[PDB]
Ligand binder design. Structure first.
Ligand SMILES: *[C@@H]1O[C@H](CO)[C@@H](O[C@@H]2O[C@H](CO)[C@@H](O[C@@H]3O[C@H](CO)[C@@H](O)[C@H](O[C@H]4O[C@H](CO)[C@@H](O)[C@H](O)[C@@H]4O)[C@@H]3O)[C@H](O)[C@H]2NC(C)=O)[C@H](O)[C@H]1NC(C)=O
Ligand SMILES: *[C@@H]1O[C@H](CO)[C@@H](O)[C@H](O)[C@H]1NC(C)=O
Ligand SMILES: *[C@@H]1O[C@H](CO)[C@@H](O)[C@H](O)[C@H]1NC(C)=O
Ligand SMILES: *[C@@H]1O[C@H](CO)[C@@H](O)[C@H](O)[C@H]1NC(C)=O
Ligand SMILES: *[C@@H]1O[C@H](CO)[C@@H](O)[C@H](O)[C@H]1NC(C)=O
Ligand SMILES: *[C@@H]1O[C@H](CO)[C@@H](O)[C@H](O)[C@H]1NC(C)=O
Ligand SMILES: *[C@H]1O[C@H](CO)[C@@H](O)[C@H](O)[C@@H]1O
Ligand SMILES: *[C@H]1O[C@H](CO)[C@@H](O)[C@H](O)[C@@H]1O
Lengths: 351, 54, 148, 351
């Protein structure tokens, strides 16, 4: 045999030994799954909820601005509908991790807004449109509203995007936990601890508690090292939470005030242009329930040994090769560490 | 309507559908529509025309 | 005599978490032959410190996995008895592509009698986008009508 | 046989036919070499001469500037010798086609000149040298002398480098001419025209002039197409000729005036810095002798037929298969065309 140390006779061959190894693998994976399931479900729930909530906020702000345009500036419709839809589509896209520039969003928005204002509100009476687009930027007709909107929405959308990425990365690492494959020696030790007693003809003998402790410390060597990075991740997320909704809702008020500011100088503008041309409660509850799992990677070997059939009394137990009266006594992990380091640096540099 | 080639009851139905309907539709597939015609013998389905926002 | 213009400056690259990238560097013409040294974010890198990074006789920096040596501004610097010359820094950013999760279980029909609902979630976490990786493509939720 | 059309008996086998083919190849290569030798040697001579003349001009300007520093600014020597040598070495390098930036040359020159001026002319009384180098550019101490010198030398060095490149490319195309390999059918036709008469037992029969004309028009099909581009190359070179020496000679006057301009503001500069820290005849003769070769690619088949044994009388001559009393009647080329087009566009855009 190659796993069960044959002290004398044996009831199992090499094939039954491979079978015991596969069952040991399945049992270890099931135990890790049972340990991680509650936290995994919590983070998956919150990720889904916040993504849906942000999409709802974007849609609400979108057709609120649409309604305000429809009520106060009917001469600017339906062009206003088109460029407002474009802007809020780009906003939702930037929220979902796409490569979008916020300042460029605001600039395209105002470059689309100004010509229809000039043609339908100031000079009622098309192909010179690009010249007007240029006059939007060259005369700074909207004053400091564009820079104000740029900063206001950029701050909130960036923190929101980083928050969603952090939630997804937490889901990913916790899901990789129960799929962690260990070394061959660790597998042979788990097989010896759980099943090699059956090869010797024993029916109800359980492994020693101290033997389980040493086996798990040998197996989970690299896995415990994830604890520091997981704690720093939880703390950085708590720092980041202590808003995207307020900015996207006040966008229409700011745009209406900007239109009024532009209209206040129409006398000289038309002449010179003709001449030239519970959410906060959900984040707080998530953080409070997540702080209870800061010791997830430190209590995992204890969980594996306490939730498996063990002889805690260390009397008449299986030490891995014989029945004794008293026991005498990285790559995937590195991937998890690197992803945690990245998300922690992002959370640190944000707040 | 009545066809010239053969004296039989022809029916033509038009359905509008606004941009607001497509942009507010949050289904899994593209906004599709199908046509069902009813006869004395049974029913018949047509092609699924998917109206999308470019 | 040492020249100012580098024969070939390192090029910035986008590489996945598992991808491998080689940074080429041809020092400027000079007698004696320029000693090429790599600096990650204005700080030298030790080839013996990590298995993932190694220095080649023809002045090349090879990275097998984007895990053991993450993103940064890699710069090639040639040293000689005359003076030193800095090349144009290459912005190497490691990007992670979005990857779909399996279909969860169908939820119970909220309505006891008549038209009900059943949901199935699909998160973007296997793998989750990193350092500005492209987000998952398609829908995240699945909803079907049920009759109880 | 596969080349000599056997009208009846024949004195040669297939092996003697391959021998005649190889001798035809050697004869064609020798004829092309004899045709191209005069033009090739002319352009090689002039290329060598102009390169040597330019190197002489660079050395003369170099030690002219050296003498002016030694006579007018002895306190700046021997540092002046060092950076003047560096500058003129880089000048010679850029002249010979190397990848050298002229603006960087002038900037390094002035960055080396300013600190020694500050330490030996303005503040009589080293490791803060780079700070002084920075103050050269941050305070714009040399005024507009650097831009003036940059433009003045860039114009002349660029036209000189392009002139040398055009000469070298002419050498390249004329040398590629005599190595042109032709098609199998062209080779068989040359073998039939020059040697297949021997297979029939004829001793002194020469091929018909019109037969030579048709054979050469079939062979030199793509080679004649080079005539337009070669003529345009000659004309563009003549346009370019109608200076590098004057600029490199006035360099010392400009540098001395720049030093005087710098010294005129020493009062505030020292305080703020201490607180902070025949040739034209040769081109004309080359162009005049080169214009005599403008019909080189158009008169080449005529040369091949007139410098080979032919029956210009068209009486009792070899038509390729029998003795008659009266005759009845690309890739490498594309490479040459592309290089000629490029050099012609450069010569056009220069002058
Ligand atoms: C958490 O970890 C578990 C364990 O690793 C993981 O379960 C796995 O899910 C993936 C989903 O991608 C399964 O892989 C699939 O296998 C099927 C059948 O062979 C393929 O059709 C799938 O291919 C799709 O994606 C490919 C990506 O390259 C495409 O090439 C292809 O065209 C398809 O689009 C896919 O490879 C895998 O089998 C399971 N593992 C087991 C043992 O069942 C789970 O995804 C992880 N994440 C979460 C949050 O659950
Ligand atoms: C926007 O909401 C208003 C109510 O505030 C509603 O009347 C209108 O139909 C909505 N329009 C769109 C485009 O959804
Ligand atoms: C063994 O069992 C006894 C029962 O009273 C208990 O007191 C003791 O703590 C147990 N040993 C260990 C190692 O837990
Ligand atoms: C990388 O270097 C370039 C200059 O070579 C600079 O513009 C850029 O900001 C640097 N990026 C980082 C992340 O340091
Ligand atoms: C050129 O260099 C020589 C070095 O022997 C020097 O004597 C001479 O003065 C310099 N040039 C001129 C033309 O004076
Ligand atoms: C041409 O041929 C005739 C004989 O047929 C001869 O007399 C005459 O000299 C020849 N002339 C030339 C120039 O070939
Ligand atoms: C998820 O989407 C599809 C499956 O429909 C694939 O392109 C790929 O598996 C992706 O991650
Ligand atoms: C869920 O949907 C189907 C299974 O019904 C597959 O395409 C795939 O497993 C997906 O995740």
């Amino acid at each position: 045999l190659q796993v069960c140390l044959p002290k004398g006779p044996t009831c199992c061959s090499r094939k039954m030994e491979e079978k015991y190894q596969l069952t040991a693998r399945l049992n270890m994976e099931q135990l890790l799954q049972s340990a991680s399931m509650e936290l995994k479900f919590l983070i998956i729930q919150n990720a889904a909820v916040f993504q849906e909530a942000f999409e709802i906020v974007v849609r609400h702000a979108k057709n609120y601005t649409n309604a305000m345009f429809k009520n106060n500036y009917p001469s600017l419709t339906p062009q206003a509908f088109e460029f407002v839809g474009e802007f809020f589509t780009d906003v939702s896209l930037y929220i979902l991790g796409s490569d979008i520039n916020v300042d460029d969003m605001v600039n395209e928005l105002f470059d689309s807004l100004f010509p229809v204002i000039y043609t339908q509100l100031m000079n009622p009476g098309l192909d010179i449109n690009e010249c007007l687009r240029g006059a939007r930027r060259d005369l700074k007709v909207f004053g400091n509203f564009p820079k104000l909107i740029m900063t206001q929405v950029s701050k909130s959308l960036q923190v929101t995007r980083i928050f969603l990425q952090a939630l997804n990365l937490g889901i990913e690492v916790i899901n990789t936990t129960d799929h962690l494959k260990f070394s061959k020696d660790c597998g042979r030790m788990l097989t010896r601890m759980w099943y090699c007693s059956y090869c010797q003809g024993l029916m109800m003998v359980k492994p020693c508690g101290g033997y389980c402790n040493v086996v798990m410390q040998g197996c989970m060597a690299g896995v415990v090292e994830i604890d520091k990075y997981w704690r720093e991740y939880i703390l950085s997320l708590e720092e980041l939470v202590n808003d995207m909704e307020n900015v996207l809702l006040g966008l229409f008020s700011t745009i209406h005030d900007s239109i009024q500011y532009v209209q206040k100088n129409a006398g000289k503008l038309t002449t010179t242009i003709g001449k030239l041309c519970t959410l906060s409660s959900r984040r707080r509850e998530l953080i409070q329930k997540l702080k209870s799992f800061i010791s997830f990677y430190s209590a995992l070997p204890g969980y594996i040994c306490s939730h498996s059939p063990v002889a805690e009394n260390d009397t008449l137990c299986w030490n891995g090769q014989e029945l004794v009266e008293r026991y005498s006594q990285e790559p995937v992990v590195s991937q998890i560490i690197d992803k945690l380091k990245h998300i922690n640096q992002l959370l640190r540099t944000m707040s | 309507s009545l066809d010239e080639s053969s004296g039989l009851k022809v029916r033509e139905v038009f359905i509008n559908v606004t941009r607001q309907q497509v942009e507010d539709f949050h289904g899994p597939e593209d906004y599709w529509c199908q046509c069902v015609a009813w006869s004395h013998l049974g029913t018949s389905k047509s092609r699924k025309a998917s109206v999308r926002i470019a | 005599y040492l020249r100012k213009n580098f024969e070939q400056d390192p090029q910035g690259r986008e590489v996945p978490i598992e991808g491998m990238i080689v940074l080429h560097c041809r020092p400027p013409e000079g007698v004696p032959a320029a000693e090429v040294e790599w600096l990650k974010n204005e700080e030298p890198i030790d080839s013996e410190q990590d298995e993932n990074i190694d220095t080649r006789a023809d002045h090349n920096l090879i990275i097998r996995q984007a895990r053991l040596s993450d993103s940064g501004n890699y710069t090639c610097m040639a040293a000689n008895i005359v003076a030193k010359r800095r090349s144009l820094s290459a912005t190497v950013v490691v990007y992670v592509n979005g990857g779909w999760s399996s279909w969860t279980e169908w939820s119970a029909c909220n309505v006891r009698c008549g038209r009900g609902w059943q949901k199935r979630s699909r998160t973007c976490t296997n793998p989750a986008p990193l350092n500005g990786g492209a987000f998952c493509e398609g829908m995240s939720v699945q909803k079907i009508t049920c009759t109880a």
